[PDB]
Amino acid sequence: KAVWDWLILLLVIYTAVFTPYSAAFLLKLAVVDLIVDIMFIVDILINFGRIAVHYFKGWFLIDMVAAIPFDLLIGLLKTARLLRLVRVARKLDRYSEYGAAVLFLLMCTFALIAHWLACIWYAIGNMEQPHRIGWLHNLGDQIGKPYGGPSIKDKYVTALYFTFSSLTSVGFGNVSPNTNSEKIFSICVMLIGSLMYASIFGNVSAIIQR
Amino acid sequence: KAVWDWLILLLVIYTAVFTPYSAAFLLKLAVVDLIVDIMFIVDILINFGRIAVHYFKGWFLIDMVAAIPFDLLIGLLKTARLLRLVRVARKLDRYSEYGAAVLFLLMCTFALIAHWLACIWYAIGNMEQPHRIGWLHNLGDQIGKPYGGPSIKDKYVTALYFTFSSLTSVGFGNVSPNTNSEKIFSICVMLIGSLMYASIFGNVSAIIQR
Amino acid sequence: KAVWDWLILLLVIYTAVFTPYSAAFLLKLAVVDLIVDIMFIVDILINFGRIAVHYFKGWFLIDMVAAIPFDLLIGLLKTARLLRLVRVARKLDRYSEYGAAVLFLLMCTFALIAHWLACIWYAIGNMEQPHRIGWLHNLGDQIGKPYGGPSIKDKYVTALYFTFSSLTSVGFGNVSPNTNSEKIFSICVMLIGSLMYASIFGNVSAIIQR
Amino acid sequence: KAVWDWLILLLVIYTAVFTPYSAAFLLKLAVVDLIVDIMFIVDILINFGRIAVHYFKGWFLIDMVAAIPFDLLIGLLKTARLLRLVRVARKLDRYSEYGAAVLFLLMCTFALIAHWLACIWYAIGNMEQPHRIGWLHNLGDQIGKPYGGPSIKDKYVTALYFTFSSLTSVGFGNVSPNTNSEKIFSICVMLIGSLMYASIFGNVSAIIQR
């Protein structure tokens, strides 16, 4: 039970890494998804004589709708598995005991936000690709893979690197927005970064200053 | 009167967004402008029998000149409506109790500063076109507009994105100053961007812990 | 007496702005410089029988050399007037009586550091005349004035803009170091600019609250 | 004894500068490092009978492995000498007695982190070169030394300048990551640089006033 919370947190991080990635890139492992689904079913069963009503009156519908699959584009309904991130929100008291723990959580949420923004950036670039101005075409031209096109590894790495440069306000200039939708996404990313980078690294400076 | 105060704040935001955009881009719907003008006249009437003398010798001498229609260049003279921004700067106590409202107002005024700088940047760029040097010519080249140049949407989005990149100290390298006017404007933008970035984001970091 | 010190501050700002500029650029008006010298001699004269020995044992040794003419490559010795900058390094207690004065002084010294680094950058770019490599050639190609070469206005504006971008960590990419001397100078600029940016803007964020 | 340990710190900085540099670049005079290791052996002898056994039970192994010559991948074994950096890592209570000394050590450790990251970057470039995607090819194209190729001076200066730009979040755009290995290394460098920049410069801003 004491170590079960950390396992649940690790599974939540795994699903928050691999659900947006799968939806954005792989839609176009299954056994691991089945295993984590079984583990989350075990956890929701564990969460439950007089405590049943208490759990029913709060944070039961969310877990019930998250655990049950939508397996009857039917694969897009699997994006609802992101609701499991609320579990770490309702148990933040146990995860905030150690300064190392909260520092690792801050780095993890920085990486998670960067990964989600990379998934959105790739989705935009792919939805604009069939309709030589987007970032995918320039990236393919600059790595010797003219549009075929770059591999999934190259596309994901480029998107994550661009998102990290935009969030950290580096702007290497290798890849830059060139379409109106890309420019608006970049502006929104600039606002999001200016907020979250400032807040998170202020918290980090507070932690180290302790 | 609180609902009226927040409605007046919304109208002030609307005019601060749409009069400099109009002056910069549109010059070479009216129903919304007429409705907002009527609402501001209603507000100045509501502002007022003992307090009438008090308000007459106060902000009335500014509100009257900010509300008089100049329909006797009229398009350039309509910029005097920017004096309505003092209607919210004189009642900071009304908009400083929610806590999150302060953060929202700070982020909104950051966006408004970016929008005003974008309007000034477009005004600088457009006045240099008749004279491939300049941000407008390069922007048209990037998309494929033989500057028949880019549409108003593309020009505004590019200007806003460049201003946000300069203010956030990213420097994407897609849009860069090349003329001495643009270079001096960018130096001034860098100075005021450092100022506003430091002050505003130190403030928001201050409230983020509360 | 009170007015005299602020006038001396204005004069020292003038000389700190126009001595490095003249040395860096105009090596290849005099009446204003002569009037400035007259005022500085007047200041040394008023700076004075009991206190005469006190001043003689104090700052007189450094003050006298910085103001006596070195008239006889002979113009390279003119930089001696830069030693007058310490005259305002001893009346901080009088120049910091108002917070707005502190803010103005901080922005003035930031701009002065940018100006001095721009002069050094131009000297570095101009000493590389014997040998497409270098910022001056790139700038001359950018603004459509191939080497001849860009005017002094364009060269100074480009140098100041590059120095400001380096100090504020924007990195527009219009001008980038491309030579070993330029790269080493840029590394030193990055180090000192990060240090002074952090210090100055932390102090500024402290000032705005106070 | 103070001068002895200050010389210890100086030679520790020397080896931290010159061992990774040699390992990365100079692989293909030794008198300086010969005297340095002789001096380290003399320090070991000085450190040593009541306290000799106590210190033997303590750190004796650390300066035993990092001092014994490996003369007999064969030449790469000298990288074990970087373990001498912990000699100053056990005397922070003494090396942090002065605020100016603290700032000097912070600047030195920032420069050392940049130097180590530049060595790693150059090692990546060299292992990728024989396989224009690499940064070394682009560097050779920029300067007048097309691939032969740039000399060791140019390569090291470019690596250090790029690493400093990445850490300081400038993004000059002259040299930018272009391969998957370079992009991943740049993401890691962005994270590391953000963290260390925040911590170190928060500390520095905490020292400037005092």
Curated annotation (Swiss-Prot), chains A, B, C, D:
Effect ascribed to mutating residue 179 to I: In LQT2; uncertain significance
Consequence the record notes for mutating residue 22 to L: In LQT2; uncertain significance
Extracellular topological intervals: 122-156, 178-183
Induction, per UniProt: Up-regulated by RNF207 (at protein level).
Cytoplasmic-facing ranges: 95-100
UniProt modification remark: Phosphorylated on serine and threonine residues. Phosphorylation by PKA inhibits ion conduction.
Effect annotated for changing residue 125 to V: In LQT2; uncertain significance
Reported tissue expression: Highly expressed in heart and brain. Isoforms USO are frequently overexpressed in cancer cells.
Protein name (database record): Voltage-gated inwardly rectifying potassium channel KCNH2
Top-level taxon: Eukaryota
Stated family: Belongs to the potassium channel family. H (Eag) (TC 1.A.1.20) subfamily. Kv11.1/KCNH2 sub-subfamily.
Gene: KCNH2
Parent-protein start and end of this portion: 407 to 665 of 1159
Effect listed in the UniProt record for changing residue 134 to R: In LQT2; uncertain significance
Outcome, altering residue 171 to A: In LQT2; uncertain significance
Effect of residue 25 to L: In LQT2; uncertain significance
UniProt-reported outcome of changing residue 193 to S: In LQT2; uncertain significance
Effect of substituting residue 101 to V: Perturbs steady-state activation. Accelerates the activation rate at the most depolarised potentials. Affects modestly the activation rate at less positive voltages
Intramembrane region spans per record: 157-177
